[PDB]
Amino acid sequence: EEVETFAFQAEIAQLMSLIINTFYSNKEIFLRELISNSSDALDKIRYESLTDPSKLDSGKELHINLIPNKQDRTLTIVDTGIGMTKADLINNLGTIAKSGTKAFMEALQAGADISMIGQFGVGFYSAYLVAEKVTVITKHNDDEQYAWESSAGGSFTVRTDTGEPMGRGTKVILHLKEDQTEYLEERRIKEIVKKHSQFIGYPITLFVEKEKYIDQEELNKTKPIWTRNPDDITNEEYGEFYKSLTNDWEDHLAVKHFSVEGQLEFRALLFVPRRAPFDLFENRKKKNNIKLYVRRVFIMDNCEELIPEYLNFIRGVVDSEDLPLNISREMLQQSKILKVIRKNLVKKCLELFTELAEDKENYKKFYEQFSKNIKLGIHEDSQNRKKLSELLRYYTSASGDEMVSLKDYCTRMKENQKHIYYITGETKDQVANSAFVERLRKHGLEVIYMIEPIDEYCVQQLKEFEGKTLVSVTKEGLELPEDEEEKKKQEEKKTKFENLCKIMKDILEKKVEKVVVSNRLVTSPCCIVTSTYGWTANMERIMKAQALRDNSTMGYMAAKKHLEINPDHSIIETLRQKAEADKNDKSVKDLVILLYETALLSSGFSLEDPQTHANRIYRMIKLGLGI
Amino acid sequence: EEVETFAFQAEIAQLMSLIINTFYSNKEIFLRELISNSSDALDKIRYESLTDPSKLDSGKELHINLIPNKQDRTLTIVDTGIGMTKADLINNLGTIAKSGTKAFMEALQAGADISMIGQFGVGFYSAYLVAEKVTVITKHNDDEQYAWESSAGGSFTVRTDTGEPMGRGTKVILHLKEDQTEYLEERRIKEIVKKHSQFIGYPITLFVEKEKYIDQEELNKTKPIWTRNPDDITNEEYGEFYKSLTNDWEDHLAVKHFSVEGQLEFRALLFVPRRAPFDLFENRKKKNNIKLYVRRVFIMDNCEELIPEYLNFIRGVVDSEDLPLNISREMLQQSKILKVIRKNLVKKCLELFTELAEDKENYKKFYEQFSKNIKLGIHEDSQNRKKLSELLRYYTSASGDEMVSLKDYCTRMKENQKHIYYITGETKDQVANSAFVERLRKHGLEVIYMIEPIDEYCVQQLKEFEGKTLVSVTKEGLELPEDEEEKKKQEEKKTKFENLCKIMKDILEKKVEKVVVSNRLVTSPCCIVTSTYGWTANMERIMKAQALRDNSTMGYMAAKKHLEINPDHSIIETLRQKAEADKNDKSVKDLVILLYETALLSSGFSLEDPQTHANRIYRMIKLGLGI
Amino acid sequence: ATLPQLTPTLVSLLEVIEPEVLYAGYDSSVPDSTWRIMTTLNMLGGRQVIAAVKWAKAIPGFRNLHLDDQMTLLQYSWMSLMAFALGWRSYRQSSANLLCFAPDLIINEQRMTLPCMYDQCKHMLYVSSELHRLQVSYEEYLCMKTLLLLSSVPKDGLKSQELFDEIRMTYIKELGKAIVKREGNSSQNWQRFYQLTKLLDSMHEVVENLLNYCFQTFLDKTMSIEFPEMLAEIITNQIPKYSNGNIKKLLFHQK
Amino acid sequence: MQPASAKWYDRRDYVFIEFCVEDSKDVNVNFEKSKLTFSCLGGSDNFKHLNEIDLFHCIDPNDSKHKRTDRSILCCLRKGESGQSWPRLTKERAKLNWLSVDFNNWKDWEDDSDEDMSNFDRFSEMMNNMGGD
Numbered sequence A, B: 001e002e003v004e005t006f007a008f009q010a011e012i013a014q015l016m017s018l019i020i021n022t023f024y025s026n027k028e029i030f031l032r033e034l035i036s037n038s039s040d041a042l043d044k045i046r047y048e049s050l051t052d053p054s055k056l057d058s059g060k061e062l063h064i065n066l067i068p069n070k071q072d073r074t075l076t077i078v079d080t081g082i083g084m085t086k087a088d089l090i091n092n093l094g095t096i097a098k099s100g101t102k103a104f105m106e107a108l109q110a111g112a113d114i115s116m117i118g119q120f121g122v123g124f125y126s127a128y129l130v131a132e133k134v135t136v137i138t139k140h141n142d143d144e145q146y147a148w149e150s151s152a153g154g155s156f157t158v159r160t161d162t163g164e165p166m167g168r169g170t171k172v173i174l175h176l177k178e179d180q181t182e183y184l185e186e187r188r189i190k191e192i193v194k195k196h197s198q199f200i201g202y203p204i205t206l207f208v209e210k211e212k213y214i215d216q217e218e219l220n221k222t223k224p225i226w227t228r229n230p231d232d233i234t235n236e237e238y239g240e241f242y243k244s245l246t247n248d249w250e251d252h253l254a255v256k257h258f259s260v261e262g263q264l265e266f267r268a269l270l271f272v273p274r275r276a277p278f279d280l281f282e283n284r285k286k287k288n289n290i291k292l293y294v295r296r297v298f299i300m301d302n303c304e305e306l307i308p309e310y311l312n313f314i315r316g317v318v319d320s321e322d323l324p325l326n327i328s329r330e331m332l333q334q335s336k337i338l339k340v341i342r343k344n345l346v347k348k349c350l351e352l353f354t355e356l357a358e359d360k361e362n363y364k365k366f367y368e369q370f371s372k373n374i375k376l377g378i379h380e381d382s383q384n385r386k387k388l389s390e391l392l393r394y395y396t397s398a399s400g401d402e403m404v405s406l407k408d409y410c411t412r413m414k415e416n417q418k419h420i421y422y423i424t425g426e427t428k429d430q431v432a433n434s435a436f437v438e439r440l441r442k443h444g445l446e447v448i449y450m451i452e453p454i455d456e457y458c459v460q461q462l463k464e465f466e467g468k469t470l471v472s473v474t475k476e477g478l479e480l481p482e483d484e485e486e487k488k489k490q491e492e493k494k495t496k497f498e499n500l501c502k503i504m505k506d507i508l509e510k511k512v513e514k515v516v517v518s519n520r521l522v523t524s525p526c527c528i529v530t531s532t533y534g535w536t537a538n539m540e541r542i543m544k545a546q547a548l549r550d551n552s553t554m555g556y557m558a559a560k561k562h563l564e565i566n567p568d569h570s571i572i573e574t575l576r577q578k579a580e581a582d583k584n585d586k587s588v589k590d591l592v593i594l595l596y597e598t599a600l601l602s603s604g605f606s607l608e609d610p611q612t613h614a615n616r617i618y619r620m621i622k623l624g625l626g627i
Numbered sequence C: 001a002t003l004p005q006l007t008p009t010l011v012s013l014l015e016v017i018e019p020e021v022l023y024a025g026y027d028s029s030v031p032d033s034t035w036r037i038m039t040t041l042n043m044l045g046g047r048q049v050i051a052a053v054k055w056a057k058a059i060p061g062f063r064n065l066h067l068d069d070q071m072t073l074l075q076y077s078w079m080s081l082m083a084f085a086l087g088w089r090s091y092r093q094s095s096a097n098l099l100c101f102a103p104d105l106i107i108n109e110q111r112m113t114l115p116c117m118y119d120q121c122k123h124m125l126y127v128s129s130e131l132h133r134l135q136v137s138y139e140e141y142l143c144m145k146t147l148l149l150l151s152s153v154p155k156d157g158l159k160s161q162e163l164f165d166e167i168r169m170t171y172i173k174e175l176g177k178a179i180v181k182r183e184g185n186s187s188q189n190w191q192r193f194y195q196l197t198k199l200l201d202s203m204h205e206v207v208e209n210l211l212n213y214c215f216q217t218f219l220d221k222t223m224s225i226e227f228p229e230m231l232a233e234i235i236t237n238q239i240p241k242y243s244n245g246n247i248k249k250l251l252f253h254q255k
Numbered sequence D: 001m002q003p004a005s006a007k008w009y010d011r012r013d014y015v016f017i018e019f020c021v022e023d024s025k026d027v028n029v030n031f032e033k034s035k036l037t038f039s040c041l042g043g044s045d046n047f048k049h050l051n052e053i054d055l056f057h058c059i060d061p062n063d064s065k066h067k068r069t070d071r072s073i074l075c076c077l078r079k080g081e082s083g084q085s086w087p088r089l090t091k092e093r094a095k096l097n098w099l100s101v102d103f104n105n106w107k108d109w110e111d112d113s114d115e116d117m118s119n120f121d122r123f124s125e126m127m128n129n130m131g132g133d
Ligand SMILES: Nc1ncnc2c1ncn2[C@@H]1O[C@H](COP(=O)(O)OP(=O)(O)OP(=O)(O)O)[C@@H](O)[C@H]1O
Pocket: A033, A036, A037, A038, A041, A079, A081, A082, A083, A084, A092, A093, A098, A099, A100, A101, A102, A117, A118, A119, A120, A121, A122, A123, A124, A125, A170
């Protein structure tokens, strides 16, 4: 056979068009591209000066200037960086995918501490997103000053410059399109720089005509500090960084600074604010506050993948030297990366909270603002429930006004306790004075008060703590450590009241699953408890009010109500006597219903048709008044 | 002066590497791209055959075949389209960003009805995301069969083929990398084709060896129908399309098919399902079941930009001939476009709902499943709030079991009604039998019953309907269409009960704002209403249960309670007499508290410390029983 | 205002839905007889199945299946579901040697003398023993029970087949969650998966044997074994489908 | 001479290094228990390349191989100890300017977390693995 061999070619005209029209979605990024090129130019000269100081004889100040001109629609960017020789000017701005920066880095001897941005070779051309024409003036230490010019028409020109000498450096002039003039506004420039390029090692100064004189404002006043060794940073320094980062006035509450080494590497700063913002979980569109940077240029922010929602109050920065960025440099090619970053960020946040917890006063401040986030995390994060649970604090029947940990509870358990007891409800007082704890209190058993709606979702996922199960005192089957004599007496009581249990069930019909004799009450005649599984009275009332709910399921899902009788109450005993004397006594029937409704309310259930209930009360009043 | 002129260059090696390593985030798209190329090839031959039928003498079938081979670890795509001449293999595959498809289109006389997919000239090289060598065999009607081969090493070769003739067509053979063998699986291929290319106009057949024959299965069996004139599509045709698209076992409830012409053009199909999906609200990852296609190729889905959340039950397709896409063809440039599309989709959805509402019982079916979505839309969408309000249906005190519109309510209003009366609450009966509507019923006034938690949000935006304001019957003061004689009687009653009111106020210090004489009760003794601002009893009940809520505002929006007295109630008259006779009579203090607490149960409030209430009752019981 | 949501897990919803234990209503003064016992159980079984229907209808996503498919799935698997309910009750009160059909109807080896209980109980006991061996949790139990409902389909497919499979996947994931929360090495979570999965597949065998027996007592009117009408109808309708191989058994593990 | 640029990644059993020399000539790869040496002439200018890599952890040179294509030279090294973590390729921690991670083929393979178990394809693999328990 005969086989012909060809080299690959490219069509320059279409290539230029694609760069301009299909690579970038946000026109303003052209400014960060030009700034990034400038910081590289400055690093190159700085690097060379390390071994040959004469390199800076042409000028020692390394900085970036931005000079808009509304009188002639241009924007000029000025560097004092290394510049380009005629040959470099032609090869690098002249060639679509040539990167001088990349070549430089490859040429460098390891371990030079240099990190530059610019491996693609395409980016200068983003200037044409807003510019009609671009003019570049350059002076290199080894050559004459030259001017490059192009409208991206497939050609460009080079001539020897005749203007003022720059000493060393570059000047890039964008001749702007008439319909892209907001870029000449002081406000707009500041917004762009602040968002994308504020963490640049060289100062950036904006030159603005005002009434005349030209003002000179440095924009990048805050240094990245996450690049410093953590042990050399004081709290005051972290605080100032934090404030300028978050536009707070208040200081930070807590901070971690750490790094991850390995095939995938990064550094990060995580801050806990002193007050929860006021929009958590309501904003809905804004999800986390962790910004991701590569070789300190901003890449992305509102990324759901970096942090689980329960940690959406952490403010912070993640910075990596090497990530697989997209051609636009606005995203990553490998989403699998985010998963790893997330595993590590979560792990460290939990360490911070654990450490914070050792400072009792600061922990109290923290918990008061973010306890909902912890509880949410327990509900959703199955991996860390074990650790999150140790951060919980609750009021208990024995804590007065302090909130205590589950471990603290455990240290006070009696030898015969096998369970951790708790009650859920609407308020601290409704639960504290509840009938459901009358015996537990009598016996000196401590009960945990859980009074936030979120507690219903949280406790459901806890089940056990350090081997002790959790027991709701509003459920059937509550067991207390008990004496033999008492157990025998309870059996006798169950037997003698069997007849009311039957009669009352017959009267109540479907209003109750069963009627039993109580072992948890002391002074209240009765109460209503729910079945072991599933919903309790509080879960039920909560589910009924979530608004965006399936109404068709509420016809199946309801708490199963059991009525318990206090065998030693005087109402119950006279009731037993009457009920046995006449099973159809109207008086009995009315009393049973009244007790049921009363118990139902005190037990936390909404009362269906409260008007009927009220009418019974009104009749009692009328009787008392002789009406 | 002397100015040199230069042309732009490449750096083919770097360009090739960017295309392969930086442009595409996924890999599955290599199939997407190769199929799209075949589609263009097929359209080109089809088009030419329209004026010269001899062009199909070489073959009449226009189709695409996919043939994985696990022994060779290759994947072959076979086309029957126009093919390439030696010159084209070299110019089109050997030149980056050259596009034959684009040139073809430019050379056509408008308005030829051909619309091809392809402009950029780089998609072919996505083949190297999974290959290894790529071999292309072509046969064009005007030339010999040739084989092109490359491994993207900077060069490629061309030789005259010697193997089996194809007649007419293109064969692309991808050798696969050792770890890319997942793309040879039947399952994986089907998933990819369905996701991206199910609406390609030519049939695609997958050839898979099975126990000892090749199973030939067509994948793209369903035609896009949105391209057809709406008047030519029967409901049955929409039905089958719909089921194929959604996998429902039943037809859509309603469909709207429309198009938009202008500087932005598109066609779309929007379907309303017969059943709300379970997890409609609850699935937080999938929202907005509207897919966006460009020139019948899938671009994106699950985008928050296309339609409001409250219309997320609508299934559908938007297909646009000329949107400006990103180089990856995964996202749209100029995202502001999506706002226009959104504006149009919403108004057309509302148009459809209105049409359904105008004359069908099917509207009841619709409403039964999606009334929540309408109400939510009222809460969030202010621009369409008026339209949305007419889609609401409610039970009223005069509708029996029918739900009626606000227009129907208006139709039946008395000549003296300047207001639309409504009540909110927990259940239909709890509301219907409420004390708050006793007098309104006496006068024959209709009251709207709102019993879903979502309603409490809806009513905060609806202030009036057709100029008639909405008034809650549980608020501080009602205007009733009373007679003049009735008005003076009300004044007489206020006067005689003034002393009682001040006495009760002192007894109830900080439990009420004031005690006043009622103009809304008939048979019930007192009840509790709330101040004009802020929350109603039902709103408070709901807000307390939202879990992810800021508790600090509970003492702010709580609103205040007012107790209203029925001056003609026998309890109240007895009370007035006693209270005036002795202000400090203990039995008065006790009666007043009991009435207060009872009033809170009839009105929608929880009691604080309900145990106290229960104890008051237990004492009444004990007295009745002689204990 | 805004409306942020927080939802319960499927497992907790299943905990709510799960029906109560029914009493047999057996008069304990009545002497043992093989047919008296079986009749009592059949009448109980009737009540349990009725409840099972109500139960299934409440399962999230089930309701959106074509109604005909819902009925089909219930009939095809009703025996599997009952075997699990029995398993659970015996395991939880184990007593490895007793079957807990109902409170009151607790059957020991000396009561389990019916020729079928002297034979077929080996399978009923097997299920209890396996739940015991693996120390199955309640949440795992509920997840598995739900999957049994979805284990048998017509060989010709369901009218709403795509949805059926989506639902099946949902419950599969829930199982896994119930396993994972037990903590331990990831390989242990996979072993446990594997083992529970094997247990589910093994119930097809259990059911097959029990049904063969059932059909025989159902049809053989020689014995005084009565059935509630509902079961009799179900049994009648399933015998000819069963016998023709028209029912496809789904397995997690092929072998 | 200059080093060729290269990318790397790994898996439980193997370490992969790709030397990015297009149109290579005279490729010589020396696999030693603790060291990898690459030598290549190549590209349009016949530039001489040399890469001496002192490895992080030992390999089995008798189960190591390479394949030259027109686009690149891929070397596959067998880890001396299966499951060994390789946070870096080399023994020393100095960054080498010419070496980077091949993120497109990077995988967090040392991750056996309880992701959704099914994931039917992942699942099936795991059931086949548990089938060997
Ligand atoms: N202000 C400058 N001073 C000196 N050299 C410059 C300047 N701007 C650009 N260059 C040269 O032009 C080349 C091309 O830069 P360009 O911004 O187009 O690509 P890049 O930075 O290499 O790629 P990327 O798109 O990844 O940023 C650089 O590699 C550099 O050699």
